[PDB]
């Protein structure tokens, strides 16, 4: 009676309201910070002439994928998690996921090149000379590949006619989605991250009668090595949920029992927010583990 009302008030109104608020709150925070974050990350590079290494041009490219995700995809990501209907029509059903898929590729690819350029620069020197000119050439290819291989993704997207629309992959047969999503979890999460991890372990064992300038070089390479591993670990953790969730859905046909549909909606919703949290996370990573970015942020915060 008197206390059963108080409980029944909670799940039909109090919980649904407190849940929806937290959803829009975390999304607006990530949207703003990730937007303000990566924007300042570019100005620290366009302004501070000393901070233009091969790694920073790649990290600037990492912001470019994050913004495409945040500005275009992220607003679309919020409305679907709230209503779970597609409201941007047949065509944005293909564009938004494609940009989002392309931004993942450009991201995970850029991180591998920063690992690869550093693995040669620190572990196998003057094998390849990596100048900013070759660093920028690499950055253009990432988009050429990301824009291509996410194309088959765009083809599978179809907006479902069945009084509200839904956007989802249209697979002609059971086996293709298993192979497609098995291949791309390997290609764009596990294979890059596992390789990049083995790369950075080789760097840690190295860095952790040489000239005073050389140890000055080691002191800078550790501050960058320390910072970059944080960026990769943050990336794997952020993308671990949605990446595993997608394989369970598409390869193992999981999340098809309707009993805890809220728990499944909830599960995926946090997984989607974690992706954009990585975009807002990275600029914060630079401010703490990079003393030159940190001064660029304080200098930018005072003028604006």
Ligand X SMILES: CCCCCCCC/C=C\CCCCCCCC(=O)O[C@H](COC(=O)CCCCCCCCCCCCCCC)COP(=O)(O)OC[C@@H](O)CO
Ligand Y SMILES: CCCCCCCCS[C@@H]1O[C@H](CO)[C@@H](O)[C@H](O)[C@H]1O
Ligand Z SMILES: Cc1cc(NC(=O)Nc2ccc(N(C)C)cc2)c2cc(F)cc(F)c2n1
Residue 60, binding choice from ligand X, ligand Y, ligand Z, none, Cβ under 5 to 8 Å by partner class: none
CA of 70: how far to CAs of 16, 94, 150, 238, in Å? 26, 17, 18, 15
Residue 30, binding choice from ligand Y, ligand X, ligand Z, none, Cβ under 5 to 8 Å by partner class: none
Residue that is written with structure tokens 């990049």 in the block: 196
CB of 15 to ligand X, least distance (A): 40
Q: Does 282 bind ligand Z (CB under 6 A)?
A: no
CA of 24: how far to CAs of 30, 81, 154, 156, 269, in Å? 10, 10, 27, 29, 11
Tokens of 20: 């929806």
The residue count for the chain: 304
Site for ligand Y (CB under 6 A): how many residues?
Answer: 30
Binding to ligand Y, residues 164-223 (CB under 6 A): 170-172, 174-176, 178-179, 182-183
Residue 246 annotated as lining a ligand binding site:
yes
CB of 302 to ligand Y, least distance (A): 38
Of positions 9, 82, 190, 263, contacts ligand Y by CB under 6 A: 82
CA of 94: how far to CAs of 89, 106, 245, in Å? 9, 18, 21
CA of 105: how far to CAs of 142, 185, 189, 222, in Å? 8, 11, 9, 27
Residue 23, binding choice from ligand Y, ligand Z, ligand X, none, Cβ under 5 to 8 Å by partner class: ligand Y
Of positions 53, 63, 110, 138, contacts ligand Y by CB under 6 A: 138
CB of 9 to ligand Y, least distance (A): 10
Q: Which residues are annotated as a binding site for suvorexant?
A: 246
Write out the residues near ligand Z by the rule CB under 6 A: 73, 76-77, 80, 96-97, 100-101, 104, 153, 167-168, 181, 184-185, 188-189, 239, 242-243, 246, 272, 275
Q: Which residues are annotated as a binding site?
A: 246
Write out the residues near ligand Y by the rule CB under 6 A: 11-12, 15-16, 19-20, 23, 82, 134, 137-138, 140-141, 144, 155-156, 170-172, 174-176, 178-179, 182-183, 251-253, 262
């Amino acid at each position: 009676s008197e206390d059963e009302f108080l409980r029944y008030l909670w799940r039909d109104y109090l919980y649904p309201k407190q849940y929806a608020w937290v959803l829009i709150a975390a999304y607006v925070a990530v949207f703003v910070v990730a937007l303000v974050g990566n924007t300042l990350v570019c100005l620290a590079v366009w302004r501070n002439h000393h901070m233009r290494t091969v790694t920073n041009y790649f990290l600037v490219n990492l912001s470019l994928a994050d913004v495409l995700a945040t500005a275009i995809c992220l607003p679309a990501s919020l409305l679907v998690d709230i209503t779970e209907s597609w409201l941007f029509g047949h065509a944005l059903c293909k564009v938004i996921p494609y940009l989002q898929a392309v931004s993942v590729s450009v991201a995970v690819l850029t991180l591998s090149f920063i690992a690869l350029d550093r693995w040669y620069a620190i572990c196998h020197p003057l094998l390849f000379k990596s100048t900013a000119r070759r660093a920028l050439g690499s950055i253009l290819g990432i988009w050429a590949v990301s824009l291509a291989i996410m194309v088959p993704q765009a083809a599978v997207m179809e907006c479902s006619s069945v009084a509200f629309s839904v956007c989802d992959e249209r697979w002609a047969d059971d086996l293709a989605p298993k192979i497609y999503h098995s291949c791309f979890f390997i290609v764009t999460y596990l294979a890059p991250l596992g390789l990049m991890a083995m790369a950075y372990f080789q760097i840690f064992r190295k860095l952790w009668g040489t000239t005073s300038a050389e140890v000055k070089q080691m002191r800078a390479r550790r501050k960058t090595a320390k910072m970059l591993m944080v960026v990769v670990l943050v990336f794997a953790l952020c993308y671990l949920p949605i990446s595993v969730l997608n394989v369970l859905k598409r390869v193992f046909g999981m999340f098809r029992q309707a009993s805890d549909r809220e728990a499944v909606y909830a599960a995926f919703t946090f997984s989607h927010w974690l992706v954009y949290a990585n975009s807002a996370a990275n600029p914060i990573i630079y401010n703490f583990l990079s003393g030159k970015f940190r001064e660029q942020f304080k200098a930018a915060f005072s003028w604006w």
